[PDB]
């Protein structure tokens, strides 16, 4: 009786949200950006190849200086690369080799990683002893760690396969806030440029916008047909893009609270592993299972180019803070740095 | 055109490459085993004889180091993290023979053996394990014989038509799991009948792993 009545109210509320979104869908992003000229063909060459990982690379993250980056592989090694010279600055042996994510602190003093061990390990890069040491092991997730991102030297947000995201106080090692509401494994998260909000995509084919300080879900974005594997904020923080196993990328807007554009092609039938934006947001770069990285026109949903330089699945990619280069990591154990030429 | 400090930066980097190469060579000489099975299927009994989120077990047997991975605690979706184990030497799958007349505690309508049978072909025919050998353990062999006298195998398999004895029921169940092998050419299944007091379980894994090494060598050498 009471349960039946409540679940009917949920359907009425869902219809109210759908009607509200349809009311504000006066135009389409395609119609708005029809007049603008296309970016043309985007040709990028492999400037650097980072060799030394001996297994599949699962994550990489640029430092904020746009020169150092950290990559994670399941050979049990976290490696910090000087991308300008391809020098290895550090090689961090991981206690658990089943790493799925890695993060570079914006200050550059810390890196984080974690995987099937359900732990986010914090590593101190700047010690008087001259070695990188584990400073914290953040325990509390009951599923594998899928993504982690630093807010500062003391705060980090992690997503897990136990359907929850958590905000951690690194100094005390306790999660101050737990973000619940996903019904599937959260596979990725992205921080807003001001780090006051973050979006997460889960395997329930839904994307949720979270308030970091308040700790509740602000908005839920649906439209994908399979698990979401990747998510990335637009440079102004007012939009984000997702990548799913249904071979599509979708651009959601926070303020319009609905999807604006889909990035798919008929030839593409493989899942998407990673997504990122260029510095201006005009280019959306996505990594695919078909060993390639396709550069999309974010405004016009046209495939601007392809980064084809890997012999296995492109598992991760990232664009520098200054926008100078893009790195792609892959299951073939290599990282490549790409940019164009005049 | 390097500076005095950039030359010393490269020397540190080459020192790092020298240790990564040394670590990778040691890793390539070790055997990685993914341990699968159902709940209360004797999986933990196997680990007890071979002495967080993923439990990794190491042991050395006849100049060969085995890394056994237990992922029973991972209640998450398997298809998201099952590709991490693509490339393990072999998969050890544990099946409880006695769990044929029993039913799942949660479902209360699905047969336990059929849950294992459905789980076996989900992993055996999985795209990441197309060419991965499987070491099938049929645990609780002694307990299975006691139940087969009172409870016939017809409860689990209605189509079964044979003697109600251990020697025929156990062989019938072995053929049922091996019949689930969707690719009987690219992979092989090693079946062993284990128990709570058996001591040859580790030797069977070593014999099976030795055969997996040979088959992989023949693929590399071009003979196969």
């Amino acid at each position, epitope marked *: 009786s009471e349960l039946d009545q409540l679940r009917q109210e949920a359907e009425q509320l869902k219809n109210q949200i759908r009607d509200a979104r349809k009311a504000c869908a006066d135009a389409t992003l395609s119609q708005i950006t029809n007049n603008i000229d296309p970016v043309g063909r985007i040709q990028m060459r492999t400037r650097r190849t980072l060799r030394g990982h001996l297994a599949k690379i699962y994550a990489m993250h640029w430092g904020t200086d746009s*020169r150092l980056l950290v990559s994670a592989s399941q050979d049990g090694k976290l490696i910090i690369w000087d991308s300008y010279t391809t020098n290895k600055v550090h090689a961090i042996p991981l206690r658990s080799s089943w790493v799925m994510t890695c993060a570079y602190a914006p200050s550059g003093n810390y890196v984080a990683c974690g995987g099937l061990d359900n732990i986010c390990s914090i590593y101190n890069l700047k010690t008087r*002893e001259g070695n990188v040491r584990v400073s914290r092991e953040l325990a509390g997730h009951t599923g594998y760690l899928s993504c982690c991102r630093f807010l500062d030297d003391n705060q980090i947000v992690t997503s897990s396969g136990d359907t929850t995201c958590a905000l951690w106080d690194i100094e005390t090692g306790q999660q101050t806030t737990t973000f619940t509401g996903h019904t599937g494994d959260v596979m990725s998260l992205s921080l807003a440029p001001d780090t006051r909000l973050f979006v997460s995509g889960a395997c329930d084919a839904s994307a949720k916008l979270w308030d970091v300080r308040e700790g509740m879900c602000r908005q839920t974005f649906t439209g994908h047909e399979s698990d979401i594997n990747a998510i990335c904020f637009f440079p102004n923080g007012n939009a984000f893009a997702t990548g799913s196993d249904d071979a599509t990328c979708r651009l959601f807007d926070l303020r319009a609270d609905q999807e604006l554009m889909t990035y798919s092609h008929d030839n593409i039938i493989c899942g998407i592993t990673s997504v990122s934006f260029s510095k201006s947001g005009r280019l959306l770069l996505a990594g695919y299972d078909d060993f390639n990285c396709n550069v999309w026109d974010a405004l016009k949903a046209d495939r601007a180019g392809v980064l084809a330089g890997h012999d296995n699945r492109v598992s991760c990619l990232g664009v520098t803070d200054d926008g100078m280069a893009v790195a792609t990591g892959s299951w073939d154990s290599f990282l490549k740095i790409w940019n164009g030429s005049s | *055109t390097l500076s005095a400090e950039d030359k010393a930066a490269v020397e540190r980097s080459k020192m790092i490459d020298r240790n990564l190469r040394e670590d990778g060579e040691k890793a390539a000489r070790e055997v990685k085993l993914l341990l699968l099975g159902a709940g209360e299927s004797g999986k933990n009994t196997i680990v007890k004889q071979m002495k967080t989120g993923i439990v990794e077990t190491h042991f050395t047997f006849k100049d060969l180091h085995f890394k056994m991975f237990d992922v029973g605690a991972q209640r998450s979706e398997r298809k998201k993290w099952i590709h991490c184990f693509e490339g393990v030497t072999a998969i050890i799958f544990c099946v409880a023979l006695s769990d044929y007349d029993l039913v799942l505690a949660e479902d209360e309508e699905m047969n336990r053996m059929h849950a294992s049978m459905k789980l076996f072909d989900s992993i055996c025919n999985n795209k990441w394990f197309t060419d991965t050998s499987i070491i099938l353990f049929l645990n609780k062999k002694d307990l299975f014989e006691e139940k087969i006298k009172k409870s016939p195998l017809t409860i689990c398999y209605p189509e079964y038509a044979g003697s109600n004895t251990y020697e025929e029921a156990a062989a019938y169940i072995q053929c049922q799991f091996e019949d689930l092998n969707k690719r009987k050419d690219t992979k092989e299944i090693y079946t062993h009948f284990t128990c709570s007091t058996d001591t040859k379980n580790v030797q069977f894994v070593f014999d099976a792993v030795t055969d997996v090494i040979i088959k992989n060598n023949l693929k590399d050498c071009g003979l196969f």
Partner: single-chain antibody
Amino acid sequence: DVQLVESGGGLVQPGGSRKLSCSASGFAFSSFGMHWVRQAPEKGLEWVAYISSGSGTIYYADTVKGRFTISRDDPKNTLFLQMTSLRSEDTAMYYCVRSIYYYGSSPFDFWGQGTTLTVSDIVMTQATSSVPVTPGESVSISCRSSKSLLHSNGNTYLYWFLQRPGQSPQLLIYRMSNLASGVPDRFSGSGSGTAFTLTISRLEAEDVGVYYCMQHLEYPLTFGAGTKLEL
């Protein structure tokens, strides 16, 4: 804590031999390159030898090359300097200096206490030998180099050290602008090309000492004469 204790010094006859040892504790010794730097009595600092991490690269000063040998024992965390045919020019206090080299590292950050031995090229110039100072007043120290220390990679390889009376030198500024860890922010390094300035705002009693500028553009590493601050 990070420690570097030197031993083996003492009075030796001319033409003799002496073995210096440097025991390291509190840091990853095998990850650091190690230097010997000596200081003649009432004179400035003089670099002696260098052995890199992993022992692959070894450098010597011209005044000691062929007579001095530098080696390390990583398992024992000991750095050695075998000296032979000792001359009266070798009379100095010998300091053990650690320096690690990777992108963004701070070489020469820790120096040893030193051991005394008594026997019976870019030019760095610090013309101002002494500067009378008063507490709370801003002081600038000038250094010059015969060659431009700015490399094509953007680094300017100039280092600043402060040797308070009775103490080992301490790193203040590395690569002409970066402030070393544990050094107050009042110290600032500014320079261009061959002329460099060390600015000490709101001078305090601890800042009293001799300041040396060292170049790390190429070997041999050379020190300035040193600028003394006195009250």
